[PDB]
Amino acid sequence: QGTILLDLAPEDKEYQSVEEEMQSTIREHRDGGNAGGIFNRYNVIRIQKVVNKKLRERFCHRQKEVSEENHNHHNERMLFHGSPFINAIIHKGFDERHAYIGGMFGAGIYFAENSSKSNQYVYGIGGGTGCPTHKDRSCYICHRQMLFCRVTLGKSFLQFSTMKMAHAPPGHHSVIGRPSVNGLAYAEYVIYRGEQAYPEYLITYQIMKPEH
Ligand SMILES: COc1ccccc1NC(=O)c1ccc(NC(=O)CCc2nc3ccccc3c(=O)[nH]2)cc1
Ligand SMILES: [Zn+2]
């Protein structure tokens, strides 16, 4: 009836694929790590596959609607997502009704191909006030969660400057905020429909305090 979480064996390719995509997309942000914390490695505590009959159906249906409107190419893409609402997402799915309105490209659901990018949002905008128990944005003790999702982009509208949107532009299904000299440091992917993203993997982890 609800969401089933399947544990993945660290000895299985799927677990391995996910972890590498998460560990190898770490990058230094102009932030100095104030939002997500100072680190260059994560300690993956566990990866669970999210299974929801209903979520999958709304996702797949949305998928061929998008196809009809894009030459039969849904343009699926694996992207990371970080927010203080993961437990709600894995059970009810993404919902644009609880979307970020204070964002670069409006009221959308944001994604990033860089795990360290979503990590800055796991505890709120700018990392908020940090983890729940120690109120520390760079804490290395608490378990953080993030998602590696299937995101249907269809025909994406590409833009450089910050123009607030409420839906995708006509003929499009997503907005990609592209890197600018005076703008973004890395790409962000936006969708204005929850059913365009499926929360495939639940990743529990800790950021790791550096070495030399
Ligand atoms: C209360 O929330 C819910 C309850 C039931 C079902 C769904 C939800 N909420 C959501 O789906 C949801 C969806 C999106 C957000 N917020 C965001 O997308 C912004 C946080 C964020 N921003 C980014 C910007 C650039 C690159 C990556 C990110 C990112 O990972 N997260 C917060 C909540
Ligand atoms: Zn903590």
* Domain ranges for the chain: 1-212
Cβ 210 vs Cβ 38: under 8 Å: yes
Ligand 2 centre distance from Cα of residue 36 (Å): 12
Other CB atoms within a 10 A radius of the CB of residue 84 amount to 14
Give, using CA atoms, the residue closest to atom 31 of ligand 1: 82
The Cα–Cα gap between 192 and 119 comes to 21
Cβ 146 vs Cβ 119: under 8 Å: yes
Ligand nearest to the CA of 137: 2
Ligand 2 centre distance from Cα of residue 126 (Å): 16
Give, using CA atoms, the residue closest to atom 9 of ligand 1: 98
Cβ 152 vs Cβ 191: under 8 Å: yes
Residue 70 CA to chain centroid, in angstroms? 23
Q: Which amino acid is at 161?
A: S
The Cα–Cα gap between 12 and 8 comes to 7
CATH, domain 1-212, list 3.10.50.40, 1.10.8.60, 3.30.300.90, 3.90.228.10: 3.90.228.10
Expt. technique: X-ray
Q: How do 42-51 and 106-111 pair as beta strands?
A: unpaired
Q: How do 76-81 and 188-191 pair as beta strands?
A: unpaired
DSSP 24-88: TT----TTTTTTT-S-S-EEEEEEEEEE-HHHHHHHHHHHHHHHHTTTS---EEEEEE--TTHHH
Residue 85 CA to chain centroid, in angstroms? 11
The Cα–Cα gap between 102 and 34 comes to 20
DSSP 116-157: HHHHTTTTSGGGTT--TTT--TT-SSSPEEEEEEEEE--SEE
Give, using CA atoms, the residue closest to atom 16 of ligand 1: 100
Helix (H) or strand (E) holding 21: helix 13-23
Q: How do 76-81 and 144-152 pair as beta strands?
A: antiparallel
Flag whether 131 is marked binding: yes
